[PDB]
């Protein structure tokens, strides 16, 4: 006298299944991104200004060596 | 005062690339004429000795011309090293 055994859902019910779109925001603000970009640009401009002025002085020294040697 | 603001808002909403390019070009046009360093660059370009400095014949009444490179007369580049 065996009872009916059959593939059925468990008692009560199966756990809820997610189906809605899940796309998080995941970012900074536009103002912050622009501000970081301009800050990086200004730091680069200042560094390049110093280095190019030093390069100009070094080139002047190199040219003076040639002027001394030319005669 | 009020038309230009609405136009700028609309342009920033629809064509930010054009607003950015026009702003950058305008700054590039305007700022050099308001800078104190623009003269300095010219002076630097004038201090670079590409060719030989040919000596002058001392006629006896040339006070400001040096007789030796290390003499105090003549142009100075002290402003450049401190820059
Ligand atoms: C003072 C210096 C000036 C020169 C420097 C700039 C260098 C080069 C930049 C310009 C290069 C050529 C620009 C070509 C212009 C394009 C004109 C055009 O066709 O515009 C329309 C669109 O209309 C526009 O022109 C866009 C807005 C108007 C111009 C952009 C803004 C103008 C100036 C804004 C910045 C001003 C300064 C910033 C102020 C900051 C706020 C205080 C194109 O869109 P469609 O192809 O038709 O789209 C179809 C698909 N939907």
JSON list of N, CA and C in Angstrom, two decimals, chain A residues 25-70:
[
{"chain": "A", "resi": 25, "resn": "UNK", "atom": "N", "xyz": [23.57, 52.71, -9.83]},
{"chain": "A", "resi": 25, "resn": "UNK", "atom": "CA", "xyz": [24.00, 54.03, -10.31]},
{"chain": "A", "resi": 25, "resn": "UNK", "atom": "C", "xyz": [25.50, 54.06, -10.54]},
{"chain": "A", "resi": 26, "resn": "UNK", "atom": "N", "xyz": [26.29, 53.83, -9.49]},
{"chain": "A", "resi": 26, "resn": "UNK", "atom": "CA", "xyz": [27.70, 53.46, -9.62]},
{"chain": "A", "resi": 26, "resn": "UNK", "atom": "C", "xyz": [28.51, 54.54, -10.36]},
{"chain": "A", "resi": 27, "resn": "UNK", "atom": "N", "xyz": [28.67, 55.68, -9.70]},
{"chain": "A", "resi": 27, "resn": "UNK", "atom": "CA", "xyz": [29.51, 56.71, -10.28]},
{"chain": "A", "resi": 27, "resn": "UNK", "atom": "C", "xyz": [29.70, 57.88, -9.35]},
{"chain": "A", "resi": 28, "resn": "UNK", "atom": "N", "xyz": [30.51, 58.82, -9.82]},
{"chain": "A", "resi": 28, "resn": "UNK", "atom": "CA", "xyz": [30.70, 60.11, -9.16]},
{"chain": "A", "resi": 28, "resn": "UNK", "atom": "C", "xyz": [29.68, 61.10, -9.72]},
{"chain": "A", "resi": 29, "resn": "UNK", "atom": "N", "xyz": [29.89, 62.38, -9.45]},
{"chain": "A", "resi": 29, "resn": "UNK", "atom": "CA", "xyz": [29.12, 63.45, -10.07]},
{"chain": "A", "resi": 29, "resn": "UNK", "atom": "C", "xyz": [29.91, 64.05, -11.22]},
{"chain": "A", "resi": 30, "resn": "UNK", "atom": "N", "xyz": [29.20, 64.72, -12.13]},
{"chain": "A", "resi": 30, "resn": "UNK", "atom": "CA", "xyz": [29.87, 65.37, -13.24]},
{"chain": "A", "resi": 30, "resn": "UNK", "atom": "C", "xyz": [30.82, 66.46, -12.79]},
{"chain": "A", "resi": 31, "resn": "UNK", "atom": "N", "xyz": [30.40, 67.27, -11.81]},
{"chain": "A", "resi": 31, "resn": "UNK", "atom": "CA", "xyz": [31.24, 68.34, -11.30]},
{"chain": "A", "resi": 31, "resn": "UNK", "atom": "C", "xyz": [32.56, 67.79, -10.76]},
{"chain": "A", "resi": 32, "resn": "UNK", "atom": "N", "xyz": [32.50, 66.70, -9.99]},
{"chain": "A", "resi": 32, "resn": "UNK", "atom": "CA", "xyz": [33.70, 66.11, -9.42]},
{"chain": "A", "resi": 32, "resn": "UNK", "atom": "C", "xyz": [34.65, 65.57, -10.49]},
{"chain": "A", "resi": 33, "resn": "UNK", "atom": "N", "xyz": [34.12, 64.90, -11.51]},
{"chain": "A", "resi": 33, "resn": "UNK", "atom": "CA", "xyz": [34.97, 64.39, -12.58]},
{"chain": "A", "resi": 33, "resn": "UNK", "atom": "C", "xyz": [35.67, 65.53, -13.30]},
{"chain": "A", "resi": 34, "resn": "UNK", "atom": "N", "xyz": [34.91, 66.57, -13.67]},
{"chain": "A", "resi": 34, "resn": "UNK", "atom": "CA", "xyz": [35.53, 67.71, -14.34]},
{"chain": "A", "resi": 34, "resn": "UNK", "atom": "C", "xyz": [36.58, 68.37, -13.45]},
{"chain": "A", "resi": 35, "resn": "UNK", "atom": "N", "xyz": [36.27, 68.52, -12.16]},
{"chain": "A", "resi": 35, "resn": "UNK", "atom": "CA", "xyz": [37.20, 69.18, -11.25]},
{"chain": "A", "resi": 35, "resn": "UNK", "atom": "C", "xyz": [38.50, 68.40, -11.12]},
{"chain": "A", "resi": 36, "resn": "UNK", "atom": "N", "xyz": [38.41, 67.07, -11.02]},
{"chain": "A", "resi": 36, "resn": "UNK", "atom": "CA", "xyz": [39.62, 66.26, -10.96]},
{"chain": "A", "resi": 36, "resn": "UNK", "atom": "C", "xyz": [40.43, 66.40, -12.24]},
{"chain": "A", "resi": 37, "resn": "UNK", "atom": "N", "xyz": [39.76, 66.40, -13.39]},
{"chain": "A", "resi": 37, "resn": "UNK", "atom": "CA", "xyz": [40.47, 66.58, -14.64]},
{"chain": "A", "resi": 37, "resn": "UNK", "atom": "C", "xyz": [41.22, 67.90, -14.73]},
{"chain": "A", "resi": 38, "resn": "UNK", "atom": "N", "xyz": [40.55, 69.00, -14.37]},
{"chain": "A", "resi": 38, "resn": "UNK", "atom": "CA", "xyz": [41.22, 70.30, -14.45]},
{"chain": "A", "resi": 38, "resn": "UNK", "atom": "C", "xyz": [42.34, 70.40, -13.43]},
{"chain": "A", "resi": 39, "resn": "UNK", "atom": "N", "xyz": [42.16, 69.83, -12.23]},
{"chain": "A", "resi": 39, "resn": "UNK", "atom": "CA", "xyz": [43.24, 69.84, -11.26]},
{"chain": "A", "resi": 39, "resn": "UNK", "atom": "C", "xyz": [44.47, 69.10, -11.74]},
{"chain": "A", "resi": 40, "resn": "UNK", "atom": "N", "xyz": [44.28, 67.93, -12.35]},
{"chain": "A", "resi": 40, "resn": "UNK", "atom": "CA", "xyz": [45.40, 67.21, -12.94]},
{"chain": "A", "resi": 40, "resn": "UNK", "atom": "C", "xyz": [46.07, 68.03, -14.04]},
{"chain": "A", "resi": 41, "resn": "UNK", "atom": "N", "xyz": [45.27, 68.68, -14.89]},
{"chain": "A", "resi": 41, "resn": "UNK", "atom": "CA", "xyz": [45.85, 69.50, -15.95]},
{"chain": "A", "resi": 41, "resn": "UNK", "atom": "C", "xyz": [46.70, 70.63, -15.39]},
{"chain": "A", "resi": 42, "resn": "UNK", "atom": "N", "xyz": [46.22, 71.30, -14.34]},
{"chain": "A", "resi": 42, "resn": "UNK", "atom": "CA", "xyz": [46.98, 72.40, -13.75]},
{"chain": "A", "resi": 42, "resn": "UNK", "atom": "C", "xyz": [48.27, 71.92, -13.13]},
{"chain": "A", "resi": 43, "resn": "UNK", "atom": "N", "xyz": [48.24, 70.78, -12.44]},
{"chain": "A", "resi": 43, "resn": "UNK", "atom": "CA", "xyz": [49.48, 70.23, -11.90]},
{"chain": "A", "resi": 43, "resn": "UNK", "atom": "C", "xyz": [50.48, 69.93, -13.01]},
{"chain": "A", "resi": 44, "resn": "UNK", "atom": "N", "xyz": [50.01, 69.33, -14.10]},
{"chain": "A", "resi": 44, "resn": "UNK", "atom": "CA", "xyz": [50.89, 69.06, -15.22]},
{"chain": "A", "resi": 44, "resn": "UNK", "atom": "C", "xyz": [51.46, 70.32, -15.84]},
{"chain": "A", "resi": 45, "resn": "UNK", "atom": "N", "xyz": [50.62, 71.35, -15.99]},
{"chain": "A", "resi": 45, "resn": "UNK", "atom": "CA", "xyz": [51.09, 72.61, -16.57]},
{"chain": "A", "resi": 45, "resn": "UNK", "atom": "C", "xyz": [52.19, 73.22, -15.72]},
{"chain": "A", "resi": 46, "resn": "UNK", "atom": "N", "xyz": [52.02, 73.21, -14.40]},
{"chain": "A", "resi": 46, "resn": "UNK", "atom": "CA", "xyz": [53.03, 73.78, -13.53]},
{"chain": "A", "resi": 46, "resn": "UNK", "atom": "C", "xyz": [54.34, 73.00, -13.61]},
{"chain": "A", "resi": 47, "resn": "UNK", "atom": "N", "xyz": [54.26, 71.67, -13.58]},
{"chain": "A", "resi": 47, "resn": "UNK", "atom": "CA", "xyz": [55.47, 70.86, -13.68]},
{"chain": "A", "resi": 47, "resn": "UNK", "atom": "C", "xyz": [56.20, 71.13, -15.00]},
{"chain": "A", "resi": 48, "resn": "UNK", "atom": "N", "xyz": [55.45, 71.18, -16.10]},
{"chain": "A", "resi": 48, "resn": "UNK", "atom": "CA", "xyz": [56.06, 71.39, -17.40]},
{"chain": "A", "resi": 48, "resn": "UNK", "atom": "C", "xyz": [56.67, 72.78, -17.50]},
{"chain": "A", "resi": 49, "resn": "UNK", "atom": "N", "xyz": [56.02, 73.79, -16.91]},
{"chain": "A", "resi": 49, "resn": "UNK", "atom": "CA", "xyz": [56.61, 75.12, -16.89]},
{"chain": "A", "resi": 49, "resn": "UNK", "atom": "C", "xyz": [57.98, 75.11, -16.23]},
{"chain": "A", "resi": 50, "resn": "UNK", "atom": "N", "xyz": [58.07, 74.51, -15.04]},
{"chain": "A", "resi": 50, "resn": "UNK", "atom": "CA", "xyz": [59.38, 74.47, -14.37]},
{"chain": "A", "resi": 50, "resn": "UNK", "atom": "C", "xyz": [60.42, 73.74, -15.21]},
{"chain": "A", "resi": 51, "resn": "UNK", "atom": "N", "xyz": [60.06, 72.55, -15.71]},
{"chain": "A", "resi": 51, "resn": "UNK", "atom": "CA", "xyz": [61.03, 71.72, -16.41]},
{"chain": "A", "resi": 51, "resn": "UNK", "atom": "C", "xyz": [61.49, 72.37, -17.71]},
{"chain": "A", "resi": 52, "resn": "UNK", "atom": "N", "xyz": [60.58, 73.00, -18.45]},
{"chain": "A", "resi": 52, "resn": "UNK", "atom": "CA", "xyz": [60.97, 73.67, -19.68]},
{"chain": "A", "resi": 52, "resn": "UNK", "atom": "C", "xyz": [61.81, 74.91, -19.43]},
{"chain": "A", "resi": 53, "resn": "UNK", "atom": "N", "xyz": [61.57, 75.64, -18.33]},
{"chain": "A", "resi": 53, "resn": "UNK", "atom": "CA", "xyz": [62.48, 76.74, -18.02]},
{"chain": "A", "resi": 53, "resn": "UNK", "atom": "C", "xyz": [63.89, 76.24, -17.70]},
{"chain": "A", "resi": 54, "resn": "UNK", "atom": "N", "xyz": [63.99, 75.15, -16.94]},
{"chain": "A", "resi": 54, "resn": "UNK", "atom": "CA", "xyz": [65.30, 74.56, -16.68]},
{"chain": "A", "resi": 54, "resn": "UNK", "atom": "C", "xyz": [65.96, 74.09, -17.97]},
{"chain": "A", "resi": 55, "resn": "UNK", "atom": "N", "xyz": [65.17, 73.51, -18.88]},
{"chain": "A", "resi": 55, "resn": "UNK", "atom": "CA", "xyz": [65.70, 73.06, -20.16]},
{"chain": "A", "resi": 55, "resn": "UNK", "atom": "C", "xyz": [66.22, 74.23, -20.99]},
{"chain": "A", "resi": 56, "resn": "UNK", "atom": "N", "xyz": [65.53, 75.37, -20.96]},
{"chain": "A", "resi": 56, "resn": "UNK", "atom": "CA", "xyz": [66.02, 76.56, -21.63]},
{"chain": "A", "resi": 56, "resn": "UNK", "atom": "C", "xyz": [67.37, 77.02, -21.07]},
{"chain": "A", "resi": 57, "resn": "UNK", "atom": "N", "xyz": [67.51, 77.03, -19.74]},
{"chain": "A", "resi": 57, "resn": "UNK", "atom": "CA", "xyz": [68.80, 77.41, -19.17]},
{"chain": "A", "resi": 57, "resn": "UNK", "atom": "C", "xyz": [69.91, 76.43, -19.56]},
{"chain": "A", "resi": 58, "resn": "UNK", "atom": "N", "xyz": [69.63, 75.13, -19.53]},
{"chain": "A", "resi": 58, "resn": "UNK", "atom": "CA", "xyz": [70.63, 74.14, -19.91]},
{"chain": "A", "resi": 58, "resn": "UNK", "atom": "C", "xyz": [71.04, 74.29, -21.37]},
{"chain": "A", "resi": 59, "resn": "UNK", "atom": "N", "xyz": [70.09, 74.59, -22.25]},
{"chain": "A", "resi": 59, "resn": "UNK", "atom": "CA", "xyz": [70.43, 74.83, -23.64]},
{"chain": "A", "resi": 59, "resn": "UNK", "atom": "C", "xyz": [71.29, 76.08, -23.80]},
{"chain": "A", "resi": 60, "resn": "UNK", "atom": "N", "xyz": [71.02, 77.12, -23.02]},
{"chain": "A", "resi": 60, "resn": "UNK", "atom": "CA", "xyz": [71.87, 78.31, -23.09]},
{"chain": "A", "resi": 60, "resn": "UNK", "atom": "C", "xyz": [73.30, 77.97, -22.68]},
{"chain": "A", "resi": 61, "resn": "UNK", "atom": "N", "xyz": [73.46, 77.17, -21.63]},
{"chain": "A", "resi": 61, "resn": "UNK", "atom": "CA", "xyz": [74.81, 76.77, -21.22]},
{"chain": "A", "resi": 61, "resn": "UNK", "atom": "C", "xyz": [75.51, 75.95, -22.30]},
{"chain": "A", "resi": 62, "resn": "UNK", "atom": "N", "xyz": [74.78, 75.01, -22.91]},
{"chain": "A", "resi": 62, "resn": "UNK", "atom": "CA", "xyz": [75.32, 74.21, -24.01]},
{"chain": "A", "resi": 62, "resn": "UNK", "atom": "C", "xyz": [75.75, 75.09, -25.18]},
{"chain": "A", "resi": 63, "resn": "UNK", "atom": "N", "xyz": [74.97, 76.13, -25.49]},
{"chain": "A", "resi": 63, "resn": "UNK", "atom": "CA", "xyz": [75.32, 77.04, -26.58]},
{"chain": "A", "resi": 63, "resn": "UNK", "atom": "C", "xyz": [76.53, 77.89, -26.24]},
{"chain": "A", "resi": 64, "resn": "UNK", "atom": "N", "xyz": [76.66, 78.29, -24.98]},
{"chain": "A", "resi": 64, "resn": "UNK", "atom": "CA", "xyz": [77.83, 79.07, -24.58]},
{"chain": "A", "resi": 64, "resn": "UNK", "atom": "C", "xyz": [79.10, 78.25, -24.68]},
{"chain": "A", "resi": 65, "resn": "UNK", "atom": "N", "xyz": [79.02, 76.95, -24.41]},
{"chain": "A", "resi": 65, "resn": "UNK", "atom": "CA", "xyz": [80.19, 76.09, -24.64]},
{"chain": "A", "resi": 65, "resn": "UNK", "atom": "C", "xyz": [80.64, 76.15, -26.10]},
{"chain": "A", "resi": 66, "resn": "UNK", "atom": "N", "xyz": [79.70, 76.06, -27.04]},
{"chain": "A", "resi": 66, "resn": "UNK", "atom": "CA", "xyz": [80.04, 76.14, -28.45]},
{"chain": "A", "resi": 66, "resn": "UNK", "atom": "C", "xyz": [80.61, 77.51, -28.81]},
{"chain": "A", "resi": 67, "resn": "UNK", "atom": "N", "xyz": [80.02, 78.58, -28.27]},
{"chain": "A", "resi": 67, "resn": "UNK", "atom": "CA", "xyz": [80.53, 79.91, -28.56]},
{"chain": "A", "resi": 67, "resn": "UNK", "atom": "C", "xyz": [81.96, 80.06, -28.07]},
{"chain": "A", "resi": 68, "resn": "UNK", "atom": "N", "xyz": [82.26, 79.53, -26.89]},
{"chain": "A", "resi": 68, "resn": "UNK", "atom": "CA", "xyz": [83.62, 79.55, -26.39]},
{"chain": "A", "resi": 68, "resn": "UNK", "atom": "C", "xyz": [84.57, 78.77, -27.29]},
{"chain": "A", "resi": 69, "resn": "UNK", "atom": "N", "xyz": [84.12, 77.63, -27.83]},
{"chain": "A", "resi": 69, "resn": "UNK", "atom": "CA", "xyz": [84.99, 76.79, -28.63]},
{"chain": "A", "resi": 69, "resn": "UNK", "atom": "C", "xyz": [85.13, 77.22, -30.09]},
{"chain": "A", "resi": 70, "resn": "UNK", "atom": "N", "xyz": [84.25, 78.08, -30.59]},
{"chain": "A", "resi": 70, "resn": "UNK", "atom": "CA", "xyz": [84.19, 78.38, -32.02]},
{"chain": "A", "resi": 70, "resn": "UNK", "atom": "C", "xyz": [85.44, 79.01, -32.63]}
]
